[PDB]
Amino acid sequence: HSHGLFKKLGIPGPTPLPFLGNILSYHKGFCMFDMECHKKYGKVWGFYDGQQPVLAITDPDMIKTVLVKECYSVFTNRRPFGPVGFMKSAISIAEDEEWKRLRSLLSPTFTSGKLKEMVPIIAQYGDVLVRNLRREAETGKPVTLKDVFGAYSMDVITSTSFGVNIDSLNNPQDPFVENTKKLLRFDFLDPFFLSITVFPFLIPILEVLNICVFPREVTNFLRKSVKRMKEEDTQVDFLQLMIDSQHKALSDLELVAQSIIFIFAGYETTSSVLSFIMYELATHPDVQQKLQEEIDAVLPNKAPPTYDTVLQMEYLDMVVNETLRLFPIAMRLERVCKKDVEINGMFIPKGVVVMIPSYALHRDPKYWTEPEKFLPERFSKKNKDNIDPYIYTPFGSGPRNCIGMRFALMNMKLALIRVLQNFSFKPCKETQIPLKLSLGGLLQPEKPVVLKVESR
Numbered sequence: 001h002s003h004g005l006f007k008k009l010g011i012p013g014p015t016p017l018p019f020l021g022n023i024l025s026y027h028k029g030f031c032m033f034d035m036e037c038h039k040k041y042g043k044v045w046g047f048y049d050g051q052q053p054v055l056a057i058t059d060p061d062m063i064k065t066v067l068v069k070e071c072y073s074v075f076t077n078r079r080p081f082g083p084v085g086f087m088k089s090a091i092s093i094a095e096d097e098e099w100k101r102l103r104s105l106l107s108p109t110f111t112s113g114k115l116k117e118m119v120p121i122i123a124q125y126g127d128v129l130v131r132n133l134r135r136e137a138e139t140g141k142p143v144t145l146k147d148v149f150g151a152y153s154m155d156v157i158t159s160t161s162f163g164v165n166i167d168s169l170n171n172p173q174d175p176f177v178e179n180t181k182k183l184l185r186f187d188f189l190d191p192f193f194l195s196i197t198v199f200p201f202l203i204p205i206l207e208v209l210n211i212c213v214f215p216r217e218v219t220n221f222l223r224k225s226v227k228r229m230k231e232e233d234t235q236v237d238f239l240q241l242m243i244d245s246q247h248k249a250l251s252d253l254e255l256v257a258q259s260i261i262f263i264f265a266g267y268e269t270t271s272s273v274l275s276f277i278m279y280e281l282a283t284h285p286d287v288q289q290k291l292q293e294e295i296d297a298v299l300p301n302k303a304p305p306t307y308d309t310v311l312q313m314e315y316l317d318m319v320v321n322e323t324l325r326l327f328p329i330a331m332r333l334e335r336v337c338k339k340d341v342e343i344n345g346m347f348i349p350k351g352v353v354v355m356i357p358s359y360a361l362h363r364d365p366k367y368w369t370e371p372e373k374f375l376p377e378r379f380s381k382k383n384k385d386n387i388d389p390y391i392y393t394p395f396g397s398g399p400r401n402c403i404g405m406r407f408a409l410m411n412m413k414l415a416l417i418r419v420l421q422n423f424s425f426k427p428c429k430e431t432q433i434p435l436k437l438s439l440g441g442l443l444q445p446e447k448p449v450v451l452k453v454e455s456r
């Protein structure tokens with residue numbers, strides 16, 4: 001859509017350039033762009049990703065209408081996305097009735113009931129993380145978190161996806177490990193994705209040549225793996241649960257598409273959040289101590305964490321939430337406007353991408369006292385009442401929110417519990433303070449986080 005849409009509707013925004021739109025304003029990443037646009041333009045603004053119009057919204061009533069009230073009718077889909085091949089069937093990429101059907105099929109799979117049955121499996125790799133952690137501390141030397149937390153994230157991934165039990169950090173040559181590893185989140189400011197934003201007319205050329213953004217080698221490998229783990233003796237993983245739910249039914253290709261997208265959805269995200277959490281805990285030693293005291297109180301002398309004990313830990317839950325306030329690694333939620341609507345007094349035309357800038361709202365002075373400050377007390381039970389759930393959106397909201405939210409929390413918390421029970425984390429002189437964010441399209445630190453690990 002032409003660069004004249006937002007002026008035509010009287011909506012403010014950075015003036016776009018011919019062809020590029022506003023992409024040159026991303027030279028400091030999505031988060032800084034979004035903060036700046038918010039401070040200079042107000043409650044609503046418009047900008048262009050190449051030819052594509054994007055309208056940013058910040059009013060919580062309007063946000064609710066997009067994410068919740070008009071999800072099925074008008075705002076069903078994420079922005080159209082590069083060449084995807086058979087991954088068009090992955091729930092996160094799927095559209096309209098195909099989406100509604102896969103969400104309906106995959107919902108039972110993410111119950112709390114199922115998640116409880118998955119707990120022992122997840123906990124088991126907590127112990128593997130601890131054992132590993134022990135050694136790279138007993139050594140001495142600063143620890144790289146993305147590495148220790150990367151391996152942990154994959155270990156839970158493999159075993160919870162289909163019972164491939166592997167010590168990922170001490171088997172960095174296992175082909176299953178070295179293939180899954182390649183399912184990292186897309187940096188949409190990298191040269192390929194920039195090019196595709198400015199030349200989106202080239203995507204169908206890429207689809208016909210089978211050039212896919214999920215590398216062919218990796219998805220080939222997994223499709224082949226899943227087929228063979230499927231075919232027999234029968235004596236609790238995502239595959240099994242999907243196998244069983246096979247308009248309804250779940251077809252074969254669709255099944256593998258989900259198995260891949262759970263990896264990609266879960267892998268770099270969990271690991272990234274875990275590293276942020278540790279960063280904050282190390283730079284706030286009092287918060288770290290307080291967390292360890294709550295853990296020792298609930299699980300006396302290092303008792304194994306359980307579904308129920310995890311859920312009782314209030315301060316743990318507060319620490320996790322406040323980290324996700326500061327580092328909401330999705331950055332933004334988006335929905336395509338399927339048809340002209342008028343929402344809370346404002347006309348949004350067909351085809352616009354409506355964007356909710358979580359990162360900016362999470363640090364908004366209007367909603368948050370000293371926004372740049374890590375303060376878990378924000379979430380204390382008698383203080384969290386004034387947290388608006390359309391301003392704080394780390395897992396998004398509505399029918400299309402994170403389907404893996406309770407799983408991701410449970411996973412992250414089971415890790416933190418086992419780590420904190422055994423260790424304390426302290427900054428090195430090599431630790432970057434204060435933390436600086438990457439200028440690329442992912443929310444992550446500029447340099448990796450390294451910290452000293454010490455047995456308690």
Ligand code: HEM
Pocket residue numbers: 091092093103261262265266267269270271273329330333334393394395396397398399400401402403404405407408
């Ligand atoms: C680790 C921390 C995680 C965070 C912060 C996170 C955040 C998000 C966000 C912001 C969305 C977009 C929702 C929206 O548009 O409103 C999303 C969607 C999604 N998440 Fe997560 N996520 C995490 C982990 C996971 C995990 C472990 C899984 C494993 C299955 C997962 C599966 C998905 C899927 C499939 C979607 C798309 C759902 C749909 O389109 O219907 N996520 N997540």
Ligand SMILES: CC(C)C[C@H]1C(=O)N2CCC[C@H]2[C@]2(O)O[C@](NC(=O)[C@@H]3C=C4c5cccc6[nH]c(Br)c(c56)C[C@H]4N(C)C3)(C(C)C)C(=O)N12
Pocket residue numbers: 030049078079080081082092093185186188197261264265266269330331332333334
């Ligand atoms: C790409 C899909 C398949 C992954 C899906 C998902 O499964 N997720 C799991 C956890 C996080 C979430 C996801 O990566 O995070 C999501 N974010 C995105 O993928 C957003 C989509 C973008 C995009 C797609 C296509 C062309 C583009 N040009 C430009 Br400029 C951008 C862009 C910005 C980019 N933003 C900032 C992120 C949601 C928070 C909206 C998302 O859609 N994800």
